[PDB]
Amino acid sequence: PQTLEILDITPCSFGGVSVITPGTNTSNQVAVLYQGVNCTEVNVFQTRAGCLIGAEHVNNSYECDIPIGAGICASYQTSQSIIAYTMSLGAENSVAYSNNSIAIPTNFTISVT
């Protein structure tokens, strides 16, 4: 009402609180993710789902143990701590194939799921 301007109202950064704690008998380090918010009132990492404190981002590829969000998931790894990374994208196995190639299964397992 004072000046000739148009201002967007983004509802102020809001969301829930997720806590990542491994097995109490295995570890006691607790990481906290603040869902739906950026790092405002909080070493510290920025994710699409929210702000993650208590975990260090890693670029490697390990087994995806505890899903966090937006494809980032955590694991208790190397002292030991909580590492959140992009979930395993795996090895690419599609090449050119033609009438002269096949992938014979030589051995299997009769698994009792």
């Binding site: 004072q2 829930g16 704690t21 109490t24 603040y34 918010v37 009132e41 143990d65």
Partner: protein
Amino acid sequence: AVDCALDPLSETKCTLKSFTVEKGIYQTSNFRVQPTESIVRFPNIL
């Protein structure tokens, strides 16, 4: 006996009513930026 506001582990055990918490992603409360100010406006010099 355990507090419900000491650390997020204590908040987690308070919410789950359990003292042996295994692997998983959990919820304790909601985060919220405080009302830092209150904005009243008025046309400039109506």
